[PDB]
Subunit: 328 residues, 2 copies
């Protein structure tokens, strides 16, 4: 009868969930063991790192006092401790860490995915993928905007979207960095300043300058978007081929990976980046000259101009460092 | 000599880091075992849940066809499967889960802190604590603003801060909920609509209506802030005393915990919440009437008015449901 089905269901649930519950309890015990082991190991690593830093400082102090015959041995020793510290950091990267000074405000939670190099590589993949999708979204929006509407409201909607973009992306960069990579630091400031740019331009409504400006600004935005497209495609290709060959750890090789696709891609992208910085400079100059027009007193045009120059300088410096590294 | 110190340092580093590296390797193996076990257990739980849902649907289908003599046994059975499903969900809460439909956009990462009820309770504690700090920050800002400056720019700064507040807090609510609690759903929409309110009011610069309005609006904001203060202090007290007695799992007891401090605190807070909803209604009415003033055509006053009424209705409904539950 229908009751017998329920009875057999009761039997199977009893047996299988008894197994499940016992397994779950043993899971709980194993997890407690794992977390105690992790805590002990992290403490040991911290203690070793402290002693290592002390010894390295002592070596640095003694080095000027060292004559050459001891200095050669000391330099070899410093090299091998440098490698040793690198190895220690590499292993520590397999163990959980503490949020640095920002997610503490934004999350205050543990996040590290120290489960596999596979997990990290995958995560970086969807990081870049989301970048490409949302960027093309902005590109379509920008094209449509410059085409159809003179509304301030459509500009406002686009601007909300842009600032939300950049905040999301700073969270990405934060998680990525505490999970470990070579961010160089000087890139997150770019996103922060771009955010402030967008906020202030969200302010300060219509005015003859505003209409004179919006078209050029939006064209720059579209060009920058397509540049980020090129960035993605190059980075995607080079990281994939690197993973195919050796590791593709995180975006950095100190060597053109394919050395033919990599070098050619870099040398084809560089004119685009130079063009982007150049047209940003042109826009900055236009705004600067316009700021002296006496027909209107705008407390926003100059506060918009200053970040443009700051960001142009930062980009030029980053590109120059990149090419200097590439040459030698 | 100084060299001998380095040699003994080499010896100690060799020994202790050999121990460390062996332990770290055994950690890696144990972690692999743990994650494989977690995957298998989660799969088993999912399969059991699927079979349980199927059986429950079958029982629901058969129930109308069931006569009373079988229906009593069937109802008892449904009760015990309801408890069984609850227990299964409770255990599943100890195991990692998948981000729901939002962090997938915002993070796309695993986050659950299923390490202890201690960890969850602590996290909720700093959640509330951050709330109180940042709220009093806004309170001071608001007082200063209504006091000194008629600048639109100070209003803009306050508004940036407010929207950043609310976005941070929606991230809090998201992590909290996928970590497990009774959010009731209808609260996050409150934060979203408040965010849109603040964005639009960030737009639409000066105008006779703007100056006529800002003072009343900011006063409402200050009152709402102090209300959130009272909210915090009550929730803090009741959750702490609940943790002292039984568990203080997450903010919910279906019973006034102290039943003297809890009931009195609720009945003292309720007038404040009623006052807040009431003054929000007064502000909404003022804006609605002003929207008919023909001296200026503002495409923003009405789009600001509609969320006020929506939010007032939502708050009134939530409070009414709360009091209905409390009465019986």
């Amino acid at each position: 009868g229908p009751l017998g089905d329920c009875l057999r269901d009761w039997e199977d649930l009893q047996q299988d969930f008894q197994n499940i519950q016992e397994t779950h309890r043993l899971y709980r015990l194993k997890l407690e063991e794992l977390t105690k082991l992790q805590n002990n190991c992290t403490s040991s690593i911290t203690r070793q790192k402290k002693r290592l830093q002390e010894l390295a400082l002592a070596l640095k102090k003694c080095k000027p006092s060292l004559p050459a015959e001891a200095e050669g041995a000391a330099q070899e020793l410093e090299n091998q401790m440098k490698e040793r510290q690198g190895l220690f950091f590499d292993m520590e990267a397999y163990l959980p860490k503490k949020n640095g000074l920002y997610l503490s405000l934004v999350l205050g939670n543990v996040n590290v995915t120290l489960l596999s190099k596979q997990a990290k590589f995958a995560y970086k993949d969807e990081y870049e993928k989301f970048k490409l999708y949302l960027t093309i979204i902005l590109i379509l929006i920008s094209f449509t905007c410059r085409f159809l509407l003179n509304s301030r409201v459509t500009d406002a909607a686009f601007n909300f979207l842009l600032v939300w973009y950049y905040c999301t992306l700073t969270i990405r960069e934060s998680i990525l960095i505490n999970n470990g990579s070579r961010i160089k630091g000087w890139w997150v400031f770019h996103h922060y300043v771009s955010t402030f740019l967008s906020g202030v331009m969200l302010t300060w409504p219509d005015g003859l300058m505003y209409q004179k400006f919006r078209n050029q600004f939006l064209s720059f935005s579209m060009y920058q978007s397509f540049v980020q497209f090129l960035q993605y495609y190059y980075q995607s290709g080079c990281l994939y081929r690197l993973r195919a060959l050796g590791e593709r750890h995180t975006m950095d090789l100190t060597v053109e990976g394919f050395q033919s696709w990599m070098w050619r891609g870099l040398t084809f992208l560089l004119p685009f980046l130079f063009f982007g910085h150049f047209w940003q400079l042109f826009n900055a100059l236009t705004l600067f000259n316009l700021a002296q027009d006496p027909q209107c007193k705008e407390w926003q045009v100059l506060m918009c101009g200053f970040p443009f120059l700051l960001l142009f300088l930062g980009n030029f410096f980053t590109t120059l460092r990149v090419v200097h590294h590439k040459f030698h």
